Design goal:
It comes from Thermus thermophilus (strain ATCC BAA-163 / DSM 7039 / HB27). The protein is α/β, with parallel strands linked by helices and about 550 residues long. Helix content is about 30%, strand content about 20%. Strand 11 and strand 12 (about 280-285) form a beta hairpin. It binds manganese (II) ion (2 copies).
Length: about 550
């Protein structure tokens, strides 16, 4: 709940990966987070009943509703939607006021992936999200998807952003000079707390290169270590890393970098009801889509963090007061677009979810839509991003949802031929990245969903042997056969042969065309992958 007693010298109110989600919505955690044996059972790879047990969270509680897919639909009906900028603002303000009334010091920290991927964002090229950050009063933020707006727009938006953007790693690609401050030291009574920022290191290979030309985001352990050391030389007693590296990478850094007391981990969209102790560092994840506000109270000492209290505060719009200024602001911004954004396109008869290592009902729906409009397509590759939303049974799908699921600034759907060998290699290559069993390199991640294909995955097999028994359209994969593929949200088209006469157009236009026509959809979970050595789980899709 929200009525917490005072604790410590400083309070951090942290959220991450909002992905421009302006309104209350639903967001189910993944039914599977598959890992090779060495990585199983650790934060970042917990789901379902196991995550509840790991954290000692009772089944059926508001925290259980946020934390796991177990009982999802039932709990969504019980507790209501999560997030919304209005409710998140109300909660942040409630907590900050409480802390300041106690004579405490509070900082509002945003872990990045904030400005993009929503109707509000696309309609304003991120501007409305920044204006919202300003209404709440965000002290710092880091970045990742922000860069898909392009360097020019990001700089414009940083002019508007009243908080202080941090990043030790964004440097010029020719001279190496950092473009932003690495950290900021804040007075917390008699102590000094440094907030160091880290943006996603893989922006260049993850998005169109044009968006970040002239910049390097490379993970630079030396530069990070020197930043931590410098903050301490300037008087910082404790050091907090506001990170967008991904939680597993943050855990690896905790064992390599000296002096990081706490890491606020974004990117992987994880939940950590209790902090994860790695080396001499505590790690707290930032969740996603506005579902939670992480309150981290710190008892500091001359040399670091003596102790801390972590609470995952559910952002439940039905259980929080309104932030009137935010409600009014959103009304002003979207009044002209409400018809477009909220009119039903179709009704979903069952649960549409996005997150999972391998398969989702939302991605299957997209595959069906693509094949319905382009019957020549044999395989549809959907991007396994961790942002999105969840549609409940009987709920209408709207344009706002389409933008929540497919609101890339580069949303083009591409149709192109791939040889069978390429299809298999694409999956094997992703598997090698997502599943490496070497704890030194593991970072995790999700696998592209390929509608029209079925395969067997063995996460523990050697590279080159993880993907087997591939079948396309009920027939064994023919390595030399040319198959017509479709893909959006990535770079797969670069190794294909473009379909003659086809003009790439936004995936959401294709989806809206399909949905308007069909009126109602019913996508029951029918996973197309068999996982060796694991039980593949599914949620309950009715109710
Ligand atoms: Mn994200
Ligand atoms: Mn990210």
């Amino acid at each position: 709940l929200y009525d917490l007693p005072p604790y410590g010298d400083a309070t951090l109110l942290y959220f991450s990966d909002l992905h421009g989600q302006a309104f209350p919505h639903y967001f189910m955690e993944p039914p599977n987070l598959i890992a090779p044996k060495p990585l199983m059972g650790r934060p970042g790879y917990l789901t379902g009943e196991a995550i509840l047990r790991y954290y000692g969270v009772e089944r059926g509680t508001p925290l259980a509703y946020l934390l796991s897919y177990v009982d999802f639909v039932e709990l969504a009906r019980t507790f209501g939607p999560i997030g919304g900028m209005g409710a998140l603002t109300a909660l942040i303000r409630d907590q900050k006021a409480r802390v300041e009334a106690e004579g405490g010091k509070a900082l509002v920290l945003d872990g990045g992936d904030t400005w993009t991927n929503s109707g509000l964002s696309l309609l304003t090229r991120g501007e409305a999200v920044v204006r919202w950050q300003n209404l709440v009063g965000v002290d710092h933020m880091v970045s990742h998807w922000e860069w898909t707006l392009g360097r020019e727009r990001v700089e414009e938006l940083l002019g508007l952003f009243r908080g202080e953007f941090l990043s030790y790693n964004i440097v010029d690609d020719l001279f190496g000079d950092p473009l932003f401050p690495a950290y900021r030291i804040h007075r917390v009574g008699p102590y000094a707390l440094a907030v160091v920022g880290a943006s996603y290191p893989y922006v260049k290979v993850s998005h169109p290169e044009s968006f970040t030309e002239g910049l390097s985001f490379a993970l630079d352990e030396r530069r990070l270590q020197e930043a931590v050391d410098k903050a301490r030389a300037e008087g910082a007693n404790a050091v907090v890393l506001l990170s967008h590296n991904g939680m597993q990478l943050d855990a690896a850094l905790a064992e390599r970098i000296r002096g990081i007391d706490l890491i606020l981990s974004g990117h992987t969209h994880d939940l950590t009801p209790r902090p994860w102790r790695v080396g001499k560092t505590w790690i707290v994840a930032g969740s996603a889509a506005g579902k939670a506000l992480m309150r981290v109270d710190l008892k500091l000492w001359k040399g670091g963090i003596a102790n801390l209290r972590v609470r995952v505060l559910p952002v439940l719009a039905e259980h929080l007061p309104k932030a009137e200024d935010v409600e009014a602001f959103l009304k002003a911004q979207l009044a002209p677009h409400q018809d477009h954004l909220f009119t039903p396109l179709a009704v979903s008869e069952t649960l549409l979810y996005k997150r999972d290592t391998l398969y989702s009902t939302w991605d299957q729906l997209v595959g069906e839509a693509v094949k319905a409009i382009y019957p020549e397509v044999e395989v549809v590759f959907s991007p396994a991003v961790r942002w999105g939303t969840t549609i409940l049974p009987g709920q209408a799908i709207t344009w706002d949802h389409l933008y929540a699921y497919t609101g890339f600034t580069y949303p083009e759907l591409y149709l192109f031929y791939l040889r069978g060998a390429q299809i298999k290699a694409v999956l094997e290559d992703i598997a090698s990245n997502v599943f490496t069993s070497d704890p030194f390199y593991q970072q995790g991640g999700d696998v592209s969903r390929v509608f029209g294909l079925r395969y067997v995955l063995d996460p523990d097999a050697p590279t080159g042997e993880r993907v087997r028994e591939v079948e396309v359209g009920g027939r064994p994969l023919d390595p030399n056969r040319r198959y017509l593929a479709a893909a959006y949200g990535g770079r797969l088209q670069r190794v294909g042969e473009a379909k003659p006469g086809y003009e790439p157009r936004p995936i959401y236009e294709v989806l809206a065309e399909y949905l308007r026509s069909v009126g109602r959809v019913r996508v029951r979970p029918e996973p197309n992958v068999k996982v060796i050595g694991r039980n593949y789980r599914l949620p309950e899709v009715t109710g």
